[PDB]
Amino acid sequence: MKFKKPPINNPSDDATIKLAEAAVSVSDSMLEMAKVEKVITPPSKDNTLTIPNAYNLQARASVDWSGPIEELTARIAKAAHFRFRVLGKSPSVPVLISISTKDESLAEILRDIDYQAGKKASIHVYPNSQVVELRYAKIY
Amino acid sequence: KFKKPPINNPSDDATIKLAEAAVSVSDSMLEMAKVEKVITPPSKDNTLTIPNAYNLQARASVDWSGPIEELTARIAKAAHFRFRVLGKSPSVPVLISISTKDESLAEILRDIDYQAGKKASIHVYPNSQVVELRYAK
Amino acid sequence: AKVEKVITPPSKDNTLTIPNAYNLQARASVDWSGPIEELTARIAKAAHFRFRVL
Amino acid sequence: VPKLPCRVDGACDATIIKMMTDLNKKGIKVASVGQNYLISIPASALFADQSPRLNWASYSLLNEIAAFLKQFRKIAITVTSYSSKYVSVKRERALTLARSRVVSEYLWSQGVDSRIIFTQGLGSDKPITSYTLGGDRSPNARVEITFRRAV
Amino acid sequence: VPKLPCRVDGACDATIIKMMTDLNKKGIKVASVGQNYLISIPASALFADQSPRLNWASYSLLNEIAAFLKQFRKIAITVTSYSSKYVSVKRERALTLARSRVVSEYLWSQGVDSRIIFTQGLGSDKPITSYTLGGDRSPNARVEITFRRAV
Amino acid sequence: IIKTGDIMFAVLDTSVNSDEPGPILATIVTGKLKGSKLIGSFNLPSNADKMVITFNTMSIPGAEKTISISAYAIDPNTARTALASRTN
Amino acid sequence: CFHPPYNNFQPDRRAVKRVGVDTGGGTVGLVASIYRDSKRKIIRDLQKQDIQYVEYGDTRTLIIPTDKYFMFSSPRLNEICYPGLNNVIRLLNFYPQSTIYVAGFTDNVGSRSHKRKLSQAQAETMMTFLWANGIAAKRLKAEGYGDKNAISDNAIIHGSAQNRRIEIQWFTS
Amino acid sequence: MYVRTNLTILSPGWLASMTSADGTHAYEMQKSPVLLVSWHGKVMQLKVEGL
Amino acid sequence: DGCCSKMGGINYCDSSAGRLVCNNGFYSTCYCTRHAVMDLQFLMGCCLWHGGVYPQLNSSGLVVCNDGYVSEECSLQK
Amino acid sequence: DGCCSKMGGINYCDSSAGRLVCNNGFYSTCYCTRHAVMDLQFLMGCCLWHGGVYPQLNSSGLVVCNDGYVSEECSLQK
Amino acid sequence: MDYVKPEAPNVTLLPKTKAEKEIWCIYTERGWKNGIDQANTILEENIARIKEDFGGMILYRKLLAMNMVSPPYVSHTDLGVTGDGSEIHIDDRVLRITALPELNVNSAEWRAAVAK
């Protein structure tokens, strides 16, 4: 007959509380700015065409990387048994990507990577030659 | 017998909120990058293709930082291809840095074209074994 | 306050009512500050209507 | 120097060779050459008959596997699965893929400090013997993990 | 800070849970969901047969539920009633409305710390029992009060 | 600014008998001036009821200066002027 | 014996092992078995656990915490509270004619479509587990709502922790 | 005095005030040891010392 | 003294609520932080509804507030 | 203390890795140089993420950073 | 937050009675509480500061999408080989921003938003 309420956990901490109370407004701001950006510009194309899937891309990978692109892409090409190609010249300021995913396709990881690159580097794959090429953009 | 819980698991009410907030901001920035990245189809790309003739299959370790005309002249002499130009040289030449330890000549030419960009390009004809360096206007 | 308050009849309210055409039944989350012309042109294009000004 | 670590925490070579000898007497093979190390495990103690579903008693085995794994330093861990020819190629490849996915997911749930986890299976493509008498009782139906100790 | 009260005035959680347990043993429905509490009383213990006249001894129970409600901080309480169908629809609608008015007026005379008391009466519009042989002796002849414990 | 007649602490670590006057050093341990050293002397009382220290020459580290604020001693944790020693 | 994976969805004979280890008395084993399968002891066990059962009127309801019963941000299920799951199916075996509704609820933060899809997936996997326990699909309705009707408040951390939930409702007839 | 909150002051009167996107208010005004606000339709006092 | 008494006891204090969250799933009536909802209906302090007491050291017993209003009631009489 | 226990003992310190190497064929756990890869994730000191502490002493009790920031937790007060 | 742990306790006047020992203990406890509050205050102010900067950057991005702020404009000047007979630089590029971003006054170029 003793009363209770279900959701009970370990006791929390006030700094985490204040972190949550900041992060909710940060996430809300991100949500509305992403919505207004999606409205204010209609997309037309996706990197599915530039990076088409093929065989031996089904080997899954879970990652936590926080460095430059090139070592990570070298490990990817080593696991993928595909030839490596680099175009353009490396800039002075390095390009650093933090990725924390869970067991996705290699093609989707690569599409995430080029989306992270944006307008600095681009990714192409030639399955006719079993190669993967990255290119630094012409800039300044 | 014993199945352990995850070690650094979000077992706290603040931590799960922080985690889903992280998921939200990551998804927002992901679709921002998706809607903002601009590409071209791989049929409309204006890059030099690979003629894949047998003379281009040689390998080299080449480091260079300077002009392009003498460079592709040396490449054509190494490939036993005749070489010519098409246009007039600008006052400031286009300087291309190359650093490779092992590469073949066709993709060497492809990255040369990629570094050249809009100001010049290269055509390679394997019917009569020639190359030309075409300027812009 | 009852005697000094003024009001308007609900029959003679000079507010444009809802014509309830089916293109007008959509929802939006919109914040805007400023002029009126871009707002009415954008909501006209959202409504897929023609537009005019007098 | 007292403000610096004398040794990396959670590391003791006597315990390393102790659990290495325990796994050797258990039967799971541990191969060490240069610095790249391989662990070969039979699948019969891990799963049921041709199924991508674990056993309850294998959780302590996975626990001590992760205890061995958190001991070292790494960058990438590669896990691959192998089976026997049963009906087709596709079913067996999917079975090995599911087993590799499950073991990689549980290992990431455990506190290994890897940066990259690669998971895949092959089925019955590269047998370690021509002794094709057994199915799930054959020693070639297996799972192998591979990594390299860094620095 | 000693001038600041450690707890809110006139409250003790042990007293609250004790009188809540006593009232649940007395036989009235107490429900807690999140921070929202709702109390249901059978009307046969409160009124006469289909009439808005009050049993005189029931004001002790009214004082008890007033003392229980004194321990909480709130703004809005919904007071409604339900009944059986006797002759019409309007009869029990007016009866439930008037009984809600009576109990809300006495509660407002007593020590309510809220700001809004809502009075509605519907009668026999939402039955909650498959059993329908009783009239006022049915459990559907009832009153209820809902609120949220705010902050 | 140090106010006219406030409190500070020091530590005495080098001993002397009250026979020949000379420099004696203490080190201020807390407060505004940190790492400071103070040299001074003592006086000879004709009566054996107490013993006090004449401290005059102060040095503050960091800046190479020498001010000469003069101050005396009190017995710690008794707040008296006596010296904890033998008089027999 | 027994299997912590739900005893492979097999109907557990709890009485025979208890009366065997008690006869190793028969009467005290029988009264212990009826004490174990007695509904009030099951309800007190569910009160010892973090799952809320309410009976009032013709409707009976169950409230299940998503955080303590699932892995985070996933329709996959926690594999620890399976004694709670076994007691859930043991209690729900008593009423083989009521229609069953299950619903999911989440808090206020995130994409609206994400909240709706997450709650729908959680309700669907819960009703899938219930269907696998033996009850046919004609009595089952799964709905996943987001922040439509909050049982708690989101401006308080503890209330927001209380907010996400699993609701089970069933009538009498 | 500069006060950031979400409530609305009653007693002293402020020279300026600002409204956020979330309805939180900021007030710039003269100093005071006390404030009066309405929280949820209920009046309340507030004390600030060390002016 | 006993906030979650005859209960599971104290779990923690939520400063989002400024309240003692008990081991049982209900907030206690006790506050922890000063940033909580304490309904204040009576207070202390001289020179109220002013700028506070003017901080000069008047030689006479007459006192004034920072707004200029004279709080002779708070001041000693003569 | 004991690094190469249950082994052949410590053979030598390889400074290219900065680590000990035991008398078996394997690398050890302990290190010998400070130019190695230790995962230092806890630090002390004040005026961090700034220009460092100010080397010139302060007449007052406050402490400024070389960036110009004030380290309040490194500053004492009453 | 910075962290210099002090491990130097010095006593001015030692406690002799249990009453003065008790008031010393509770005043030490109250000072412990005060230091806790000050740490929370500093943390909260820094939280507000970094949230302010993040909100300012994301509001700049959102207002640029709202077409109220000019983008920055930056020119490039490239030169080939340069230097004396002792020093050479193969290609130098000098990048210089010439037009800082700013808000506009002409209201007509402001595209609003819509949603579904």
Show the 3-state SS of chain D: CCCCCCECCCCCHHHHHHHHHHHHHHCCEEEEECCEEEEEEECCCCECCCCCCECCCHHHHHHHHHHHHCCCCCCEEEEEEECCCCCCCHHHHHHHHHHHHHHHHHHHHCCCCCCEEEEEEEECCCCCCCCCCCCCCCCCCEEEEEEECCC
Distance of alpha carbon B124 from alpha carbon B118, whole angstroms: 17
The counts of H helices and E strands in chain A are 3, 5
Q: Is there a contact between A16 and B18 (Cβ–Cβ < 8 Å)?
A: yes
Q: Is there a contact between F35 and F10 (Cβ–Cβ < 8 Å)?
A: no
Contacts of C2 (CB under 8 A, 6+ apart): none
**What is the enclosing helix (H) or strand (E) of K16?**
none
Number of Cβ atoms within 10 Å of the Cβ of A33: 19
Q: After which residues is chain I broken (C to N over 2.5 A)?
A: none
- Contact list, J23 vs chain D (CB under 8 Å): none
Q: Is there a contact between G86 and G129 (Cβ–Cβ < 8 Å)?
A: no
Long-range contacts of range I17-25, CB-CB < 8 Å, 24 or more positions apart? I17/E151, I17/G156, I17/G157, I17/G158, I19/E151, I21/A11, I21/G158, I22/E13, I23/A8, I24/A3, I24/A4, I24/A5, I25/A4, I25/A5, I25/A6, I25/A7, I25/A8, I25/G162
SS3 E109: helix
- Contact list, A31 vs chain G (CB under 8 Å): 110-111
- Contact list, G151 vs chain I (CB under 8 Å): none
The reply to whether I71 touches chain A by the CB within 8 Å rule is: no
φ and ψ of F47, to 5 deg: -105, 150
Distance of alpha carbon A10 from alpha carbon A16, whole angstroms: 13
Long-range contacts of range F5-12, CB-CB < 8 Å, 24 or more positions apart? F8/F33, F8/F71, F9/K10, F9/K12, F10/F38
- Contact list, D56 vs chain G (CB under 8 Å): 3-5
Distance of alpha carbon D19 from alpha carbon D14, whole angstroms: 9
How many A×D Cβ pairs under 8 Å? 39
| Single-letter amino acid code for the residue at D70 | K
Distance of alpha carbon G15 from alpha carbon K29, whole angstroms: 58
- Contact list, E75 vs chain H (CB under 8 Å): 40-41
CA H41 from chain centre, in angstroms, equals 15
Distance of alpha carbon G23 from alpha carbon G26, whole angstroms: 6
* Alpha helices (runs of H) in chain C, residue ranges in sequence order: 37-47
* Residue A88, both tokens: 């353009």
CA distances (Å), origin K78, targets K89, K95, K99: 12, 8, 19
CB contact under 8 A, B93 and K79: no
CB contact under 8 A, F62 and J56: yes
**What is the enclosing helix (H) or strand (E) of K40?**
helix K18-65
CB contact under 8 A, F9 and K14: no
- Contact list, E14 vs chain I (CB under 8 Å): 2, 5-7
* Residue H19, both tokens: 């409204």
Q: Is there a contact between D133 and D94 (Cβ–Cβ < 8 Å)?
A: no
Distance of alpha carbon D39 from alpha carbon D79, whole angstroms: 9
For K68, counting Cβ atoms within 10 Å of its Cβ (0-12 exposed, 13-18 middle, 19+ buried), the class is middle
Residue in chain E closest to A1 (alpha carbons) equals E21
State how beta strands B96-104 and D142-148 pair.
unpaired
CA C17 from chain centre, in angstroms, equals 8
Contacts of K43 (CB under 8 A, 6+ apart): A15, A18, K1
- Contact list, I28 vs chain E (CB under 8 Å): 7, 13
Q: Is there a contact between D109 and B6 (Cβ–Cβ < 8 Å)?
A: yes
Residue in chain A closest to K78 (alpha carbons) equals A140
Distance of alpha carbon J60 from alpha carbon E72, whole angstroms: 53
**Longest CA–CA separation in chain B, Å:** 80
- Contact list, I27 vs chain G (CB under 8 Å): 158
The reply to whether G26 touches chain D by the CB within 8 Å rule is: no
SS3 B51: coil
State how beta strands E116-119 and F65-67 pair.
unpaired
Long-range contacts of range I42-48, CB-CB < 8 Å, 24 or more positions apart? I42/H45, I43/H34, I43/H45, I43/H47, I44/E3, I45/H33, I45/H34, I45/H47, I46/I71, I46/I74, I47/H33, I47/I71, I47/I74, I48/H33, I48/H34
| HEC secondary structure over D64-100 | HHHHHHCCCCCCEEEEEEECCCCCCCHHHHHHHHHHH
φ and ψ of G23, to 5 deg: -85, -15
For K42, counting Cβ atoms within 10 Å of its Cβ (0-12 exposed, 13-18 middle, 19+ buried), the class is middle
φ and ψ of E21, to 5 deg: -65, -40
* Residue E32, both tokens: 């807690």
Owner of token pair 């006192």: I63
CB contact under 8 A, K10 and F77: no
Distance of alpha carbon G43 from alpha carbon G48, whole angstroms: 9
Distance of alpha carbon C20 from alpha carbon J53, whole angstroms: 70
Gap between the terminal Cα atoms of chain I: 46
Q: Is there a contact between B56 and B105 (Cβ–Cβ < 8 Å)?
A: yes
- Angle CA(K54)–CA(K60)–CA(K65) in degrees, nearest 5? 130
- Angle CA(A68)–CA(A73)–CA(A76) in degrees, nearest 5? 140
Interface of J with F in 4-43 (CB under 8 A): none
For A125, counting Cβ atoms within 10 Å of its Cβ (0-12 exposed, 13-18 middle, 19+ buried), the class is buried
Owner of token pair 């707890």: E7
CA distances (Å), origin D12, targets A76, D74, E106, I2: 33, 17, 76, 49
Distance of alpha carbon H11 from alpha carbon C1, whole angstroms: 24
Q: Is there a contact between A50 and D92 (Cβ–Cβ < 8 Å)?
A: no
- Contact list, K38 vs chain J (CB under 8 Å): 72
**What is the enclosing helix (H) or strand (E) of J26?**
none
Q: Is there a contact between A60 and D119 (Cβ–Cβ < 8 Å)?
A: yes
Q: Is there a contact between E22 and E64 (Cβ–Cβ < 8 Å)?
A: no
The reply to whether J57 touches chain F by the CB within 8 Å rule is: yes
Number of Cβ atoms within 10 Å of the Cβ of J49: 9
CB contact under 8 A, A3 and I24: yes
**What is the enclosing helix (H) or strand (E) of A115?**
helix A106-117
Number of Cβ atoms within 10 Å of the Cβ of F43: 11
CA distance G61 to chain D (A): 33
Task: Name the E strands within chain A.
Answer: 60-65, 83-87, 99-100, 121-126, 131-136
Q: Is there a contact between F51 and F83 (Cβ–Cβ < 8 Å)?
A: yes
| Single-letter amino acid code for the residue at I24 | N
Distance of alpha carbon K51 from alpha carbon K49, whole angstroms: 5
Q: Sheet with D116-123: list strands edge to edge.
A: A99-100, A60-65, D116-123, D76-82, D142-148, D36-42, D29-33
Distance of alpha carbon H15 from alpha carbon A73, whole angstroms: 60
Query: Do chain B and chain J touch with ≥3 beta carbon pairs under 8 Å?
Result: no
Measured in angstroms, the resolution is 4.6
Q: Is there a contact between B64 and B20 (Cβ–Cβ < 8 Å)?
A: no
Distance of alpha carbon A80 from alpha carbon A71, whole angstroms: 14
- Contact list, A24 vs chain G (CB under 8 Å): 109
CA distance K79 to chain B (A): 8
Q: Is there a contact between G82 and G6 (Cβ–Cβ < 8 Å)?
A: yes
Closest CA to G108 of G51, G163, G70, G40: G163
Residue of G58, G156, G162 lying closest to E128 (CB–CB): G58
**Residue I3 backbone class (left: φ over 0; alpha: ψ -120 to 50; beta: rest):** alpha
The reply to whether C9 touches chain K by the CB within 8 Å rule is: no
Query: Do chain G and chain A touch with ≥3 beta carbon pairs under 8 Å?
Result: yes
Q: Is there a contact between A58 and D99 (Cβ–Cβ < 8 Å)?
A: no
Q: Sheet with J19-22: list strands edge to edge.
A: J10-14, J19-22, J27-31
Distance of alpha carbon J26 from alpha carbon J30, whole angstroms: 12
Query: Do chain K and chain D touch with ≥3 beta carbon pairs under 8 Å?
Result: no
Distance of alpha carbon B98 from alpha carbon B64, whole angstroms: 5
The reply to whether J55 touches chain F by the CB within 8 Å rule is: no
CA distance B8 to chain K (A): 23
The counts of H helices and E strands in chain I are 0, 3
CB contact under 8 A, A15 and K58: no
Contacts of K104 (CB under 8 A, 6+ apart): K68, K69, K70
Residue in chain A closest to I11 (alpha carbons) equals A11
Distance of alpha carbon B14 from alpha carbon A11, whole angstroms: 10
* Residue B113, both tokens: 């074209």
Residue of I39, I41, I48 lying closest to H33 (CB–CB): I48
| DSSP state, residue G4 | T
- Angle CA(E11)–CA(E15)–CA(E16) in degrees, nearest 5? 75
Owner of token pair 């707002």: C39
Owner of token pair 């002016």: H51
CA distances (Å), origin J74, targets D1, G119, K45: 24, 49, 17
| DSSP state, residue J36 | S
| DSSP state, residue G130 | H
Distance of alpha carbon I3 from alpha carbon I12, whole angstroms: 12
The reply to whether K114 touches chain A by the CB within 8 Å rule is: yes
CA D69 from chain centre, in angstroms, equals 9
Q: Is there a contact between K72 and A44 (Cβ–Cβ < 8 Å)?
A: no
